[PDB]
């Protein structure tokens, strides 16, 4: 279930900065300084971020229409 | 209108995405064999046949009887034609029988008050030697009025009404609150687990590491209110919030903070029935049970 | 008229059905309407009342202190449903701009020769009930500017 | 008639009047497959 | 037998005699609002056009349900 | 009336705006959202979708890109909105995420302002093909119509006499938040252009000693957009419509009597 | 923009408004209020899921004026404030 | 001699089925009205024809 593009509340788009926001989380980089290094400013672009699933993987594999 | 268990979500906020749920159903037509030999073989009903369920409902069907996916199935449509054997040419012979020796029309078709799109046509073989084929047809469902949430708190309720964004309560950020909970239920029901979640959800959203909340040895209560105390806002949740119909600061400091909420499936759209004269008992004229019958 | 149903709004049913013939009709408007059971056969008192906001707003509304200016009166008598010309008169406290109490905008409701007197729950002072008590029993219409700022 | 396509992809194209298997695959089931034809969803 | 049809707790004086199933009613959910009088109802839209009242014109309502019968039943 | 502009930055402003009252500053900000018009995709004709997602979702982020809108070209102040529909096509096939970059635009005017969004994942052989079909529409319909956003506040002044203790902690506090601060001998007056959440020590100062006097008729404005409007080309289009909407009235006016 | 006129005496207007919104008539109402004549202007949208685009005005004066003239000079303020506004706008981006 | 509200509820309910199967109506015309709104405003003006019996 990819990232949704805006977010909920306020409108923004957030889905051109998921994939460049997750490759910088897993070398170990807090992600409090992360989101701040982008452009999220608030707390209501910032749940839907921190906070995702991303399971399409799962599901794409098993290929039936 | 968010008074005595209900609750006031935005509009805006439902036509971005907030909980569109999706639903399913399966149905399972077969191909049976009697004990004498005839077969019931599936097609395109023709006019003539007894019991016709009625004509252009069959809009969607193929030559040998299966929806190819994706059409809009809706009301009373059928799903598989279904042709059945004379079954006892020899029985009655109640005036006209002898001669019209024909076959009675059987079939599946939807649930009477539902919709929704098909998505996969199954066709195989079971057990013995038969053939059965399964059709599902899922639904798009949009959260209107109605449609019970609740917390794993126990405040459960229903959608009051959908107000649009414009009209909201508003706060001196850039924050428009969806949730507009009914004050008169927490020092009522004796539930301070609520609001000790509702600021962690504000701490671990600015801080950017999600707390621990586990029972017992889990994340204090004091530690939480001075990391909040520290990022930048009042230590007890309390903002100045402007209204949004005439827009002046409310004479007091209204709590928000983030409660996380799920939706639950006892949605209006399979609660809602009437009936003005419909199909009765044999034995007693009188109605039947169920919405299934 | 949520406690003759004993009713709350977390997702409950309520069934309705229509009669027909024009003699069950009448008698289901005259007989069995809303306004003809607004007090109870169990125990006399009203059942059809008021409810949790109800009650608490209008605590805020009588309060020692409750002023409200002149665009909020001109707002909220079109609100509740009332027709009244141009007469909310006569903004009681210019001290810091014209402006009205708390008092008067909840005395447009209530018919013209009403004539009550009760001591309710907030009572934390009996003392000072009293002495407005005593006046009143002795001297049946005393003026309604002078001794009754003493309430 | 039809081209239906079993699990595990293939193709088999044949009828229904008398056996329903997949020779390549020698299972036995079988989806039929979307057609190519245009409709219109809206998009709300 | 004829005396578990008579009788047992769902028999042939309060199961289907003197308590009976009925026709035109309905029931769903329910939401509140304070902006109708006391004694108002909101109705449905659905369950506005599967319940019927008969009205047996006269002469002053003539005009009425010529214009209701003339419009089908869609337009509500 | 006058402007000060604090800051300008690429889809955000933030200004203040002295000289108007409590009713005007609601109107301003309440047809910005509710008035301007974007373009925005309407309806999506399928083809195929082999992919892993259902119909409606891939239909439903289509709705959800952000579209360049040319102000020169049609008309953003009539009552009634232009009918001009464009065609935005697609034709993808596997394996590989497909990004908003890949759509087709019948008009070169009117392209995704943000090239980088994904729409859905890709396997082998999965094939996608459908035709985008947009038009002009205003936020108050449906949410996809929004141009951005507008927020606004007080402006206030806060007062610290030097008989407080400890008030070199709001010097440091207000300096490290942006805060103006004009310092005195008398006292000290920050100028809270943002929030200023007060810290624990000074709340039982708050009346005695420490008060807020708000500034009559000043107010911090923030506007923020997405890449289909200039993000100063926001509020002079909304002026413009208040004076047309409130030109109709005199004419219905006038007819009546 | 159709108005609905509903009860009409002396010195006393109401009506109703259709396709406008709180937008304008919170504007308008706070704007009428600023002339002396007019003792008594206010407004009311009933039930907004039913109706929310038809709000309820009522206008009275002290009879030294019309309530049409009342509406008249109203809505000629509003447009000349913003017409103020937006040059101002204009010339200070530069 | 007034009514109580149990013959009040049958006087309206007689009436309202006369003036559906004919029975010619008084001063009551506007514009469409229920036959069972027609009796109510009859009974208001006090010009029933039905009288009650009182067994004593
Ligand atoms: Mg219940
Ligand atoms: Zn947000
Ligand atoms: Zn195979």
Same mark, same amino acid.
């Given at each position: 279930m990819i990232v949704p593009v805006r977010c909920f509340t306020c409108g923004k788009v957030l889905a051109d900065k998921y994939y460049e926001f997750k490759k910088r989380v897993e070398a170990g980089e807090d992600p409090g300084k992360v989101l701040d290094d982008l452009?999220?400013?608030?707390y209501c672009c910032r749940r839907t971020l921190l906070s995702?699933?991303?399971?399409?993987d799962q599901v794409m594999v098993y290929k039936v229409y | 209108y968010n008074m005595e268990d209900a609750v006031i979500i935005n509009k805006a906020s439902i036509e971005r995405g907030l909980a569109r749920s999706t639903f399913f159903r399966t149905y399972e037509a077969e191909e049976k064999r009697y004990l004498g030999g005839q077969k019931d073989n599936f097609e395109v009903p023709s006019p003539?046949?007894?019991?016709?369920?009625?004509?252009?409902?069959?809009?969607?069907?193929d030559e040998d009887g299966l929806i190819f996916p994706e059409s809009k199935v809706e009301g009373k449509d059928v799903l598989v034609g279904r042709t059945s054997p004379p079954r $006892?040419?020899?029985?009655?012979?109640?005036? !006209?029988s002898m001669v019209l020796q024909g076959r009675r029309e059987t079939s599946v078709t939807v649930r009477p008050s539902e919709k929704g799109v098909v998505d996969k046509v199954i066709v195989t073989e079971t057990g013995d030697g038969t053939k059965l084929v399964k059709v599902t047809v899922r639904d798009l469902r949009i959260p209107e009025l109605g449609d019970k949430f609740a917390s794993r708190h126990g405040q459960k309720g229903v959608i009051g009404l959908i107000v649009p964004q414009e009209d909201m309560p508003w706060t001196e950020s850039g924050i428009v609150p969806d949730l507009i909970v009914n004050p008169h239920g927490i020092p009522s029901r004796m539930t301070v687990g609520q609001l000790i979640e509702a600021i962690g959800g504000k701490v671990a959203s600015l801080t950017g590491r999600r707390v621990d909340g586990t029972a $017992?040895?889990?994340?204090?209560?004091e530690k939480l209110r001075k990391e909040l105390e520290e990022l930048?806002?009042?230590?007890?949740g309390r903002e100045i919030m402007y209204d !949004?119909?005439?827009?002046?600061?409310?004479?007091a400091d209204i709590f928000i903070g983030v409660i996380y909420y799920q939706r639950l499936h006892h949605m209006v759209a399979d609660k809602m029935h009437a009936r003005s004269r419909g199909p009765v008992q044999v034995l007693t004229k009188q109605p039947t049970e169920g919405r299934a019958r | 008229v949520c406690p003759p149903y004993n009713?709350?709004?977390?997702?409950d049913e309520m069934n309705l059905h229509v009669p027909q013939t024009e003699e069950a009709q009448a008698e289901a408007k005259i007989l069995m309407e809303?306004?003809?059971?607004?007090?109870?056969?169990?125990?006399?008192?009203?059942?059809?009342a008021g409810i949790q906001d109800h009650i608490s707003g209008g605590y805020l509304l009588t309060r020692e202190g409750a002023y409200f200016t002149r665009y909020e009166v001109e707002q909220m008598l079109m609100f509740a449903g009332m027709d009244v010309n141009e007469?909310?008169?006569?903004?009681?406290?210019?001290?810091?701009?014209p402006l009205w109490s708390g008092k008067t905008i909840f005395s447009?409701?209530?018919?013209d020769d009403l004539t009550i007197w009760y001591r309710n729950?907030?009572?934390?002072?009996?003392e000072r009930c009293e002495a407005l008590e005593k006046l009143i029993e002795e001297k049946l219409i005393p003026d309604p500017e002078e001794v009754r700022k003493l309430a | 008639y039809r081209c239906a396509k079993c699990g595990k992809e293939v193709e088999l194209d044949l009828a229904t009047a008398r056996e329903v298997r997949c020779?390549?695959?020698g299972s036995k089931i079988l989806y039929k497959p979307r057609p190519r034809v245009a409709r219109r969803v809206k998009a709300i | 037998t004829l005396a578990q049809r008579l009788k047992?707790?769902?028999?042939?004086?309060?199961?289907?005699? @003197?308590g009976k199933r009925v026709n035109f009613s309905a029931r769903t959910v329910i939401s509140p609002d304070p902006?109708? @009088?006391?004694?108002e109802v909101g109705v449905p839209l659905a369950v506005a056009m599967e319940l019927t009242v008969p009205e047996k014109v006269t002469e002053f309502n003539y005009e009425k349900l010529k214009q209701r019968v003339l419009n089908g039943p869609e337009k509500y | 009336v006058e402007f000060k502009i604090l800051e300008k930055r690429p889809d955000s402003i933030k200004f203040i705006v002295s000289g108007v009252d409590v009713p005007f500053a609601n109107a301003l900000r309440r047809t910005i959202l509710s008035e301007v018009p974007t373009f925005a995709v309407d309806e999506v004709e399928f083809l195929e979708n082999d992919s892993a997602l259902f119909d409606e979702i891939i239909a439903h982020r289509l709705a959800m890109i952000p579209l360049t809108t040319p102000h020169?070209?049609?008309?953003?102040?009539?009552?009634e909105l232009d009918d001009y529909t464009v065609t935005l096509s697609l034709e993808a096939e596997g394996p590989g995420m497909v990004y908003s970059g890949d759509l087709k635009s019948?008009?070169?005017?009117?392209? =995704?302002?943000? =090239?980088?969004?994904?729409?859905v994942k890709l396997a082998e052989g999965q094939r996608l093909t459908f035709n985008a079909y947009a038009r002009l529409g205003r936020g108050?319909?449906?949410?996809?119509?929004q141009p951005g956003f507008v927020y606004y506040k007080y402006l206030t002044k806060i007062h610290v006499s030097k008989?407080? =203790?400890?008030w070199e902690e709001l010097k440091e506090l207000a300096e490290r938040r942006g805060l103006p601060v004009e310092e005195s001998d008398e006292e000290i007056v920050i100028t809270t252009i943002k929030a200023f959440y007060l810290p624990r020590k000074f709340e039982e100062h708050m009346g005695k000693g420490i008060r807020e006097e708000i500034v009559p008729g000043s107010f911090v404005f923030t506007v923020e957009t997405?890449?289909?409007?200039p993000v100063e080309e926001i509020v002079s289009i909304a002026l413009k419509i208040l004076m047309r909407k409130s030109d109709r009235f005199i004419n219905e006016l006038h007819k009546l009597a | 923009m159709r108005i609905e006129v509903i009860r009409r005496e002396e010195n006393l207007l109401e009506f109703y408004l259709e396709g406008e919104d709180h937008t304008f008539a919170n504007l308008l109402t706070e704007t009428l209020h600023?002339?002396?004549?007019?003792t008594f202007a206010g407004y009311t949208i009933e039930?907004?899921?039913?109706?929310?685009?038809k709000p309820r005005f009522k206008v009275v004066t002290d009879?030294?004026?019309?309530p049409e003239k009342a509406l008249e000079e109203a809505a000629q303020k509003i447009f000349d404030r913003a017409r103020e506004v937006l040059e101002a706008w204009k010339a200070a981006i530069e | 001699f007034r009514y109580t509200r149990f013959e009040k509820a049958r006087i309206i309910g007689a009436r309202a089925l006369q003036i559906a199967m004919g029975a010619p109506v008084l001063?009551?015309?506007?514009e469409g009205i229920t036959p069972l709104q027609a009796a109510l405003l009859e009974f208001e003006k006090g010009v029933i024809p039905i009288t009650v019996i009182r067994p004593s």
């Open positions: 452009g999220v400013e608030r995702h699933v991303e399971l399409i | 003539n046949i007894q019991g016709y369920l009625g004509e252009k409902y069959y809009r969607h069907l $006892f040419i020899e029985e009655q012979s109640s005036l !006209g $017992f040895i889990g994340e204090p209560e930048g806002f009042k230590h007890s !949004g119909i005439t827009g002046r600061r409310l004479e | 009713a709350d709004f977390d997702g809303v306004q003809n059971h607004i007090i109870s056969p169990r125990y006399g008192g009203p059942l059809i007469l909310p008169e006569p903004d009681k406290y210019e001290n810091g701009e447009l409701l209530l018919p729950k907030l009572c934390d002072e009996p | 020779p390549y695959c | 047992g707790k769902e028999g042939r004086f309060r199961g289907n005699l @003197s902006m109708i @009088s006391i004694n | 020169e070209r049609f008309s953003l102040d009539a009552l019948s008009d070169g005017d009117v392209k =995704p302002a943000n =090239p980088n969004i994904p729409i108050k319909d449906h949410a996809k119509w008989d407080v =203790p400890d997405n890449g289909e409007l | 600023e002339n002396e004549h007019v039930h907004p899921i039913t109706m929310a685009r009879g030294k004026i019309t | 001063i009551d015309v506007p």
